[PDB]
């Protein structure tokens, strides 16, 4: 429950401001950046700042501070999730979100902030339906704005009818410095690009363990869906009943389901390395990289980052397969292997220098994070079974799918 939604620059002056209730005065935004530096330099950097009785809920963009002010007990996650939805809708609208978009396209953005929120209440925050009556190129509002189904307007028509499914894996991993797995979970996310005609209804078929236990087919290969969080469009009561993903799809690109599970399968790329940290001379990274998965998949464009000392100099890399760029701007290396097959081990030997004089402060030991990407492969083994298009007209759409294995935060701790 915010009284005034604000966007500041990186200095603290108003890029754009939008009050709703008058509970927060407009002059109180000027205290934000001094309070930001005041709490930040003492380690009290929080998304909620305070100035007496006025709060400052904020998320941070690259150049923008979406300041959301309230005075009374605001509903907090309401405010922060509306900030994220404002970020997502404006990123749909303005593909780069900078001060050139704020200070020059100011005709439409005040109207957007008036439409998305009244009195501190988000009412209609979908991007595609808001496109249909808020343009920069006006008629009545659509009934889909007023409809229960408020993500798919009638009147959409395409020549061909294609449904593109993107099963994207993301292996989360935190391997300690000893060499054991502390957490091997997988957050999977299916994003769909649906180009259909009218008001279709889609029933997704998956190889669920729980659904096959409801069926009696729980002895074949299946996925153990530990948790799934769906879009609004999925009728969740029917999914609670019999694991049924029943949804009218939104139009275009949208993420259907964000599932999460735990996986006791070995990690995809194992990183072993020894570090011979000599005093004031040099460092050595005898890093090896073996793949534990099958000998049929090839990991595209991996970027195995090893964090390095900050003031290293004269970099040397005796590699076997793959190029290295030393990135001292982030104080790291990028050992890039474009084609990384499965079942193979590629060695890399790095050698640096080190200044003879020590530093005033320490540097820290960041873990190893790699950036693999594998097509036609799911580590979970999850497979889409069917996708029944339901239409009053009645036709044959094209449910296409590809399997992508990527990473989430694929961390391996260093010495």
């Amino acid at each position: 429950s915010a009284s005034a939604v604000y966007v500041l620059d990186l200095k603290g002056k108003v890029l754009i401001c939008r009050n709703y209730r008058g509970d927060v005065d407009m002059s109180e935004v000027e205290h934000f950046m001094p309070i930001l530096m005041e709490k930040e330099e003492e380690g009290m950097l929080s998304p909620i700042l305070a100035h007496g009785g006025v709060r400052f809920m904020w998320i941070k963009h690259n150049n923008l501070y979406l300041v959301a002010t309230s005075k009374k007990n605001a509903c907090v996650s309401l405010v922060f999730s509306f900030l994220y939805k404002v970020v997502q809708v404006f990123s749909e609208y303005f593909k780069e979100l900078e001060e050139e978009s704020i200070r020059d396209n100011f005709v439409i953005i005040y109207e957007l902030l008036d439409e998305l929120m009244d009195f501190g209440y988000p009412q209609t925050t979908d991007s595609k339906i808001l496109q249909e009556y808020i343009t920069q190129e006006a008629p009545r509002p659509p009934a889909t704005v007023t409809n229960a189904v408020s993500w798919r307007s009638e009147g959409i028509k395409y020549r061909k009818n294609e449904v593109f499914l993107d099963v994207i894996e993301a292996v989360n991993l935190l391997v300690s410095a000893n060499g054991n797995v502390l957490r091997s979970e997988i957050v999977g996310s299916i994003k769909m690009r649906v180009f259909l005609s009218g008001m279709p209804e889609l029933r997704l078929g998956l190889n669920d363990k729980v659904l096959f236990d409801n069926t009696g087919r729980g002895k074949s290969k299946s996925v153990e869906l530990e948790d799934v969080k769906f879009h609004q469009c999925v009728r969740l009561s029917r999914f609670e009943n019999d694991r049924t993903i029943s949804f009218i799809p939104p139009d275009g690109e949208f993420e259907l389901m964000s599932y999460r599970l735990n996986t006791h399968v070995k990690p995809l790329i194992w990183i072993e390395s020894v570090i011979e940290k000599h005093s004031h001379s040099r460092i050595e990274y005898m890093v090896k990289a073996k793949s534990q998965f099958k000998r049929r998949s090839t990991a595209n464009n991996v970027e195995i980052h090893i964090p390095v000392p900050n003031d290293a100099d004269s970099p040397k890399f005796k590699t076997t397969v793959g190029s290295v760029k030393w990135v001292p701007e982030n104080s790291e290396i990028v050992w890039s292997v474009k084609s990384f097959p499965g079942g193979k081990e590629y060695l890399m030997r790095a050698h640096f220098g080190l200044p003879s004089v020590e530093a005033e402060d320490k540097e820290g030991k960041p873990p190893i994070s790699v950036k693999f990407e594998i097509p036609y492969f799911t580590t979970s083994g999850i497979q889409v079974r069917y996708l029944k298009i339901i239409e009053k007209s009645g036709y044959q759409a094209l449910p296409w799918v590809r399997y992508i294995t990527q990473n989430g935060d694929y961390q391996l701790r260093t010495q």
Binding site: F164, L165, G205, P375, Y376, V384, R385, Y386, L387, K388, I389, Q396, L398, P399, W400, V401, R402, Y403, I404
Partner: peptide, 13 residues
Amino acid sequence: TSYDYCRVPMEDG
């Protein structure tokens, strides 16, 4: 989208 697609069966009755 250099990674090509695969077609699923529609019904799986």
